Design an enzyme around this catalytic site. Structure first.
Site, PDB file in Angstrom:
ATOM      1  N   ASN A 145       0.805  -1.218   0.000  1.00  0.00           N
ATOM      2  CA  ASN A 145       0.000   0.000   0.000  1.00  0.00           C
ATOM      3  C   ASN A 145       0.842   1.273   0.000  1.00  0.00           C
ATOM      4  OD1 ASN A 145      -2.387   1.431  -0.111  1.00  0.00           O
ATOM      5  ND2 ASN A 145      -2.943   1.128   2.047  1.00  0.00           N
ATOM      6  N   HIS A 203     -14.292  -4.353  11.608  1.00  0.00           N
ATOM      7  CA  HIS A 203     -13.987  -2.989  12.025  1.00  0.00           C
ATOM      8  C   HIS A 203     -15.255  -2.253  12.427  1.00  0.00           C
ATOM      9  CE1 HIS A 203      -9.751  -2.404  10.125  1.00  0.00           C
ATOM     10  NE2 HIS A 203      -9.940  -3.662  10.483  1.00  0.00           N
ATOM     11  N   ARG A 252     -13.216  -5.007  16.246  1.00  0.00           N
ATOM     12  CA  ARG A 252     -12.202  -4.024  16.577  1.00  0.00           C
ATOM     13  C   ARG A 252     -12.943  -2.713  16.734  1.00  0.00           C
ATOM     14  NH1 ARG A 252      -7.646  -1.235  12.872  1.00  0.00           N
ATOM     15  NH2 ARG A 252      -9.466   0.083  12.417  1.00  0.00           N
ATOM     16  N   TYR A 287      -6.952   7.612  14.140  1.00  0.00           N
ATOM     17  CA  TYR A 287      -6.866   6.437  13.277  1.00  0.00           C
ATOM     18  C   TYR A 287      -8.135   5.578  13.320  1.00  0.00           C
ATOM     19  CZ  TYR A 287      -6.279   1.583  12.095  1.00  0.00           C
ATOM     20  OH  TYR A 287      -6.481   0.310  11.605  1.00  0.00           O
ATOM     21  N   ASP A 292      -6.665  -1.195  18.021  1.00  0.00           N
ATOM     22  CA  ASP A 292      -5.413  -0.952  17.305  1.00  0.00           C
ATOM     23  C   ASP A 292      -4.880   0.422  17.723  1.00  0.00           C
ATOM     24  OD1 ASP A 292      -3.346  -0.681  15.492  1.00  0.00           O
ATOM     25  OD2 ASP A 292      -4.566  -1.272  13.746  1.00  0.00           O
ATOM     26  N   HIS A 318      -2.009   1.604  16.771  1.00  0.00           N
ATOM     27  CA  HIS A 318      -1.509   2.156  15.508  1.00  0.00           C
ATOM     28  C   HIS A 318      -0.260   3.036  15.712  1.00  0.00           C
ATOM     29  CE1 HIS A 318      -2.165   2.974  11.143  1.00  0.00           C
ATOM     30  NE2 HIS A 318      -2.827   1.834  11.233  1.00  0.00           N
ATOM     31  N   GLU A 366      -3.214  -3.787  19.852  1.00  0.00           N
ATOM     32  CA  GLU A 366      -2.384  -4.007  18.664  1.00  0.00           C
ATOM     33  C   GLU A 366      -1.445  -2.833  18.373  1.00  0.00           C
ATOM     34  OE1 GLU A 366      -3.357  -3.992  13.777  1.00  0.00           O
ATOM     35  OE2 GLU A 366      -4.881  -4.567  15.253  1.00  0.00           O
ATOM     36  N   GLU A 422       1.975  -6.182  11.595  1.00  0.00           N
ATOM     37  CA  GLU A 422       1.546  -5.906  10.220  1.00  0.00           C
ATOM     38  C   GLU A 422       2.607  -5.152   9.406  1.00  0.00           C
ATOM     39  OE1 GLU A 422      -1.806  -3.497  11.508  1.00  0.00           O
ATOM     40  OE2 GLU A 422      -1.150  -1.984  10.055  1.00  0.00           O
ATOM     41  N   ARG A 426       1.144 -10.556  13.611  1.00  0.00           N
ATOM     42  CA  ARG A 426       0.184  -9.967  12.666  1.00  0.00           C
ATOM     43  C   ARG A 426       0.630  -9.958  11.206  1.00  0.00           C
ATOM     44  NH1 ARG A 426      -4.366  -8.336  12.362  1.00  0.00           N
ATOM     45  NH2 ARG A 426      -4.065  -6.097  11.986  1.00  0.00           N
ATOM     46  N   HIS A 428      -2.876  -9.700   9.558  1.00  0.00           N
ATOM     47  CA  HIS A 428      -3.357  -8.460   8.976  1.00  0.00           C
ATOM     48  C   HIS A 428      -4.266  -8.815   7.797  1.00  0.00           C
ATOM     49  CE1 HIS A 428      -2.115  -4.618   6.573  1.00  0.00           C
ATOM     50  NE2 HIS A 428      -3.209  -4.393   7.280  1.00  0.00           N
ATOM     51  N   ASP A 481      -6.011  -3.633   1.675  1.00  0.00           N
ATOM     52  CA  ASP A 481      -4.818  -3.436   0.841  1.00  0.00           C
ATOM     53  C   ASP A 481      -4.014  -4.720   0.655  1.00  0.00           C
ATOM     54  OD1 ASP A 481      -4.458  -2.344   3.664  1.00  0.00           O
ATOM     55  OD2 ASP A 481      -2.351  -2.544   3.135  1.00  0.00           O
ATOM     56  N   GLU A 540      -8.325 -11.062  10.516  1.00  0.00           N
ATOM     57  CA  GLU A 540      -8.940  -9.756  10.266  1.00  0.00           C
ATOM     58  C   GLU A 540      -9.795  -9.776   8.999  1.00  0.00           C
ATOM     59  OE1 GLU A 540      -6.140  -6.509   9.835  1.00  0.00           O
ATOM     60  OE2 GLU A 540      -7.731  -5.047  10.166  1.00  0.00           O
ATOM     61  N   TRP A 562       2.094   7.396  12.173  1.00  0.00           N
ATOM     62  CA  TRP A 562       0.692   7.285  11.800  1.00  0.00           C
ATOM     63  C   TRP A 562       0.198   5.871  12.053  1.00  0.00           C
ATOM     64  CZ3 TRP A 562      -1.646   4.305   7.924  1.00  0.00           C
ATOM     65  CH2 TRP A 562      -3.043   4.473   7.839  1.00  0.00           C
TER      66      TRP A 562
HETATM   67  O1  LIG Z   1      -5.044  -3.164  11.460  1.00  0.00           O
HETATM   68  C1  LIG Z   1      -5.160  -2.744  10.275  1.00  0.00           C
HETATM   69  O2  LIG Z   1      -6.148  -3.077   9.563  1.00  0.00           O
HETATM   70  C2  LIG Z   1      -4.097  -1.871   9.691  1.00  0.00           C
HETATM   71  O3  LIG Z   1      -3.453  -1.165  10.696  1.00  0.00           O
HETATM   72  C3  LIG Z   1      -4.610  -0.961   8.622  1.00  0.00           C
HETATM   73  O4  LIG Z   1      -5.467  -0.022   9.172  1.00  0.00           O
HETATM   74  C4  LIG Z   1      -3.453  -0.247   7.984  1.00  0.00           C
HETATM   75  O5  LIG Z   1      -3.529   1.098   8.299  1.00  0.00           O
HETATM   76  C5  LIG Z   1      -3.439  -0.420   6.479  1.00  0.00           C
HETATM   77  O6  LIG Z   1      -3.583  -1.744   6.113  1.00  0.00           O
HETATM   78  C6  LIG Z   1      -2.166   0.106   5.869  1.00  0.00           C
HETATM   79  O7  LIG Z   1      -1.961  -0.211   4.531  1.00  0.00           O
HETATM   80 MG   LIG Z   2      -3.348  -2.409  12.524  1.00  0.00          MG
END
Ligand SMILES: O=C(O)[C@H](O)[C@@H](O)[C@H](O)[C@H](O)CO
Ligand SMILES: [Mg+2]
Ligand SMILES: O=C(O)[C@H](O)[C@@H](O)[C@H](O)[C@H](O)CO
Ligand SMILES: [Cl-]
Ligand SMILES: [Mg+2]
Ligand SMILES: [Mg+2]
Lengths: 393, 390
Positions: free
Chosen positions: B37, B122, B147, B159, B198, B200, B224, B250, B271, B300, B304, B327, B390
């Site tokens: 991604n 989600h 989540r 996020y 998450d 993040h 996470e 991830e 992940r 993950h 993407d 997920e 991020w």
């Molecule tokens: O837990 C998740 O699903 C991931 O953190 C996504 O939110 C990522 O931000 C994305 O896949 C990046 O390409």
């Molecule tokens: Mg994540």
């Protein structure tokens, strides 16, 4: 202003492939950075062209640290050779611009000179031990104080560092190499004495206990370093070597991040860190690696093969000139065509480099000349054991 | 049987995907996800210019040798672009191998270990209340696990235009707010629901330790990506201070990114997914290392990663002893059309396909109707302008 007006890559093959990033500001001043990743060149070119370059436009070129973090963290997927080379190219070009704006050669910007010249080593290679010895004599005559020595292994057609777009296939025997290599260093010492610095690159082929054995076997010959003994994705791979030999150890030309070597340094498992500017995230990141190394008496020994461009070489010579814990600089002279494509002001004399005095890192690119030499695909070799096992090259 | 052809397909049916196709001299083919991604074209070029030419004429059956050839042979080892290129090849080769065997992929890996694959959805909203409405909705679809993310008051962006969007972040406001979300989820939905969150990458270790402790009463399934983990020791303070289960990985691409995390028992779920973690060959080794330490898989599974990854992951999930959860972010209809597949979603769980291979293919004619469109991931800055995680 120092706002970025344009940024773009240049791909050229003046004897071998080089990728260069150029950044041009609204005021017309420009900087360049090396982005060459041997055998994977177009991956970095695309990383830059498609994903980094569009994000550079309009940025304040003076914001080096911010740009570094923006690209490093902002990529989301962090570290890696393609990733860190792209970041390195940007970083080098921004430092070039900063140094030009300051009206100073790069070494002055970094903190000024710590030495009056930069010691190098040359590649001495040969089919037989005797062949290699002849090459040592030639380079000593040229004024080199340090030589890397490699020779053929009897009973094996191809050995690293001894003399079409796909990987060539070499064959390897660890056991034959282990018994032969000490004979090379003995012969170097017998012919050339003790004052010469003698280096050897193991080039990833051993296990840790095999490298420990080799290290012990070559202690009598007092090598400047034994380089790249074992693959080191698992940094603990160095521990057995260190606990068993006092032969100094070098590693890191294949690394791209401080996180590839933080433990190696902090645990005192190496003496020289080899990661160069082009692959290790540029000046910004390598300053941090060298400083960490200095806490543990570790010195810099930049990878300096021809697959790093004159842009990297010029910037490295500046870095080498300032950095307190400098160890040595690898020297592999570029072709005449490469030198012409990359006008520069570093100089080589009597076995040493002298940093340039012009503002910037002192290197430029002649774009019209570069355009005369189109990209030619070329891959690095692979190595297989005698039974066909895909090994480490 | 040799590889006669290999090439990438780039398509954007709702978002960008890169796929590798490998074809043998007997005309059998396999495909692999190569999507990274926001850096997609770097992998495309890695494959097109450097890997694809070396695949021609190789024995397709030599999966291990090919993996090592590409991994070691690259010389410059590991990394997101590198390991995604390798993963794409590996998935396509496993696809061919399973087809050659006349078996769905999970059979090749060692057969079925479970009858279905539990997922999480989600659930997100601006306010806690908005999020709770999403939880109710997903529970109604049959999800056993959700989540949850919600907005932080006082901050415009939390996020969960081809250039990176710029978001603004306050850690302190998030730390005070987040426990209230989980409390509300438990108050409304009870204790049987699995609840995930998450972080993040936004916290330092002692901040994540604080958060872990604060959310212990809500018994999260996992917390996470608490902290950036290039330095794997970053997880240690969190683990020594909380019993909230931890998940990470991830953004990893190598077993070398997580060997210590696993061996020191610093995490509960790994992940890293097939596309970015070097494919089936490498992820089997990662899952197996995890198993020695009670660590479970939590692939993950965001959009993407293409349906090619998803199908292969469902096969992997169906075999692997130490499966934790999968997920689920549903792909667009257009994406599903471009990648016909035989995995099914039913009552909160995936069911593996039964057709030989990983059960996913690509409709190249349809793929061509959706050209690549540049799209970058956001960046995160602190209130003072500091470029953050991020
Ligand atoms: O837990 C998740 O699903 C991931 O953190 C996504 O939110 C990522 O931000 C994305 O896949 C990046 O390409
Ligand atoms: Mg994540
Ligand atoms: O010590 C060295 O100079 C290196 O090992 C080179 O020989 C590498 O093989 C080459 O730079 C790879 O691209
Ligand atoms: Cl990479
Ligand atoms: Mg070397
Ligand atoms: Mg304790």
């Amino acid at each position: 202003s120092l706002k970025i007006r344009d940024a773009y890559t240049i791909v050229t093959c003046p004897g071998r492939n080089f990728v260069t990033l150029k950044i041009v500001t609204e005021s017309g001043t420009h900087g360049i950075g090396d982005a060459t990743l041997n055998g994977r060149e177009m991956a970095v070119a695309a990383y830059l062209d498609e994903h980094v370059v569009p994000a550079l436009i309009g940025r304040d070129a003076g914001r080096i640290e911010d740009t570094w973090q923006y690209l490093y963290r902002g990529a989301y997927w962090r570290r890696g050779p393609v990733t860190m080379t792209a970041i390195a190219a940007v970083d080098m070009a921004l430092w070039d611009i900063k140094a030009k704006a300051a009206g100073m050669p790069l070494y002055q910007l970094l903190g000024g000179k710590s030495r009056e010249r930069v010691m190098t080593y040359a590649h001495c290679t040969g089919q037989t031990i005797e062949d290699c010895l002849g090459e040592v004599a030639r380079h000593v005559e040229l004024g080199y104080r340090a030589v890397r020595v490699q020779s053929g292994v009897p009973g094996i057609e191809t050995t690293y560092g001894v003399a079409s777009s796909l990987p060539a296939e070499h064959v390897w025997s660890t056991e034959k190499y282990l018994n032969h290599a000490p004979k090379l260093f003995a012969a170097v010492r017998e012919r050339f004495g003790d004052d010469l610095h003698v280096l050897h690159d193991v080039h990833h082929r051993l296990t840790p206990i095999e490298a420990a054995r080799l290290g012990k076997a070559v202690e009598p010959y007092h090598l400047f370093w034994l380089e790249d003994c074992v693959p080191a994705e698992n940094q603990e791979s160095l521990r057995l070597i260190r606990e068993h030999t006092t032969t100094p150890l070098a590693i890191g030309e294949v690394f791209n991040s401080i996180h590839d070597c933080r433990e190696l340094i902090q645990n005192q498992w190496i003496d020289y860190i080899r990661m160069p500017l082009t692959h290790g995230g540029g000046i910004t990141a390598m300053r941090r690696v060298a400083d960490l190394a200095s806490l543990y008496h570790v010195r810099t020994g930049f990878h300096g093969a021809t697959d790093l461009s004159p842009v990297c070489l010029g910037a490295a010579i500046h870095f080498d000139t300032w950095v307190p814990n400098f160890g040595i600089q690898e020297h592999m002279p570029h072709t005449d065509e490469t030198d012409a494509v990359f006008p520069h002001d570093y100089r080589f004399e009597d076995g040493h480099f002298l940093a340039g005095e012009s503002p910037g890192h002192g290197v430029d690119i002649d774009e019209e000349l570069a355009a005369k030499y189109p990209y030619e695909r070329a891959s690095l070799p692979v190595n297989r054991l005698e039974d066909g096992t895909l090994w480490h090259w």
